[PDB]
RNA sequence: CCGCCGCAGGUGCAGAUCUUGGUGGUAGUAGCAAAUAUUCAAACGAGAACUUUGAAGGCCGAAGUGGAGAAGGGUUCCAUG
């Protein structure tokens, strides 16, 4: 909710940080085996665990 | 790419494809049908008329519970259609083969399409939701269409 | 020759007789845009906002019987449409449609 | 094309709902590009955006129906649905007296 | 990669409401029918029954489809594409 504790607001902070793209240079690289990032999570797909 | 049928002579054939197309197969196989025997303009002529319903498409083979119409009757057939979607994304494709026919230089109004042919595509995975908490799949049926003019008198 | 204006009282009652309820004055509506295209032959027709006001006068329930139209053919500006000659239908705001014969009016 | 943001802003720059924000429809360049709050408040001081007045419920038949009800009329035997104990209660008569 | 001579076996499939993956007929069929209702003009645009704006006609009718919060959500907020 609103009312947050420090740790859980924290946890969200990290969540938004992993829920970005991948770069459009890391797939030019030798070793190409990423196409896009799969454990993209969205708010009505997955619930985020809690 | 490499097409189904090689046509009389590559001089006086011009290409046109379309490759994984969001209209349906049976309407469309069924509208490309009716083309197959048509002159460039005949052909644009009949299809803009089935997009304003003037002439229609007769549904032959995929016609399981397709209602009738008055002008199926011209066709020699009592069911028929106006597909307006599968129409109209055949007549972006003569607009792709007229123009091919341009830049190779044929005759805008002598080709008359000889071969044209509809492939299924790749189904689009989405889904329904049904009774009792049971979900069944709601796939798109997308097809791949490809044509070659060919010049006559 | 085609810039050609007359006046027209339209009989909504009896292209609107049967239809139901919410899909009257709407339907009303489709009637002067059919009969605009019978008289003045022009696929292009606009019906003025002035005229949608007296159609929906009484509700959708509820249409006047008799309603009068000076129906004005016209040419067009630049920007070229499929059709060139549209028709502008303009509201005629008469107290009595008694002895109305349809007027050709004068540009 | 979009004059969403331009509604919401000049409601809560009015003061009203987004129901009474009148914008000028031949003018609509001009709002297209506000971009902030003090720039919809220059379209009201050149006179673009501007607040509608309060829809009429005029009570005017309200009154003049009053003043036959002061006089006894609308009132009959045919015009009560409560009891004489619910439209004007005895413990209050009492009370007066 | 294979023939011959020996050796070895997780060695031959139509079935098991077999297991996994895929595709058919049904079928362009059932369906997109709860809570009154949308119409006109203009704009942007390749494109309008739906978008935006104005003008209509309506509904919720202060125990509301209104204005806010708790729990839950976790960026869904707001702008620009």
């Known amino acids: ?50 | 790419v490499r097409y189904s049928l090689d046509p009389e002579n590559p001089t006086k054939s011009c290409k046109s494809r379309g490759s994984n197309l969001r209209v349906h197969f049976k309407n469309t196989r069924e509208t490309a049908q009716a083309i197959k025997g048509m002159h460039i303009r005949k052909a644009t002529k009949y299809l803009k008329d089935v997009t304003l319903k003037k002439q229609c498409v007769p549904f032959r083979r995929y016609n399981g519970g397709v209602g009738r119409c008055a002008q199926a009757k011209q066709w020699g057939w009592t069911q028929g259609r106006w597909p307006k979607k599968s129409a109209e994304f055949l007549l972006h494709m003569l607009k792709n083969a007229e123009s091919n026919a341009e830049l190779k230089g044929l005759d805008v109004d002598s080709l008359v399409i000889e071969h044209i042919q509809v492939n299924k595509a790749p189904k689009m995975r989405r889904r329904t939701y049904r009774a009792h908490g049971r979900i069944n799949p709601y796939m798109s049926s997308p097809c791949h269409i490809e044509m070659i003019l060919t010049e006559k008198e | 020759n085609e810039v050609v204006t007359r006046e027209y009282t339209i009989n909504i009652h009896k292209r609107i007789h049967g239809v139901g309820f919410k899909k009257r004055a709407p339907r009303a509506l489709k009637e002067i845009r059919k009969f605009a295209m019978k008289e003045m032959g022009t696929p292009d027709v606009r019906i003025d906002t002035r005229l949608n006001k007296a159609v929906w006068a009484k509700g959708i329930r509820n249409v006047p019987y008799r309603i009068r139209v000076r129906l004005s053919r016209k040419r067009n500006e630049d920007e070229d449409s499929p059709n060139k000659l549209y028709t502008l239908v303009t509201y005629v705001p008469v107290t009595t449609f008694k002895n109305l014969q349809t007027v050709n009016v004068d540009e | 094309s979009m004059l969403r943001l331009q509604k919401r802003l000049a409601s809560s720059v009015l003061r009203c709902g987004k129901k009474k924000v009148w914008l000028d429809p031949n003018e609509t360049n001009e709002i297209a590009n506000a971009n902030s709050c003090q720039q919809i408040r220059k379209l009201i001081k050149d006179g673009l955006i501007i607040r509608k007045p309060v829809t009429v419920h005029s009570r005017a038949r309200c009154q003049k129906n009053t003043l036959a009800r002061r006089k006894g009329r609308h009132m009959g035997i045919g015009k009560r649905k409560g009891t004489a104990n619910a439209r004007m209660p005895e413990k209050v008569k009492w009370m007066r007296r």
């Open chain 1, 1 to 50: 909710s609103s009312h947050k504790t420090f740790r859980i607001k924290r946890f969200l902070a990290k969540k938004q940080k992993q829920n970005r793209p991948i770069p459009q240079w890391i797939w030019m690289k030798t070793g190409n085996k990423i196409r896009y990032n799969s454990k993209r999570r969205h708010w009505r797909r997955t619930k985020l665990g809690l």
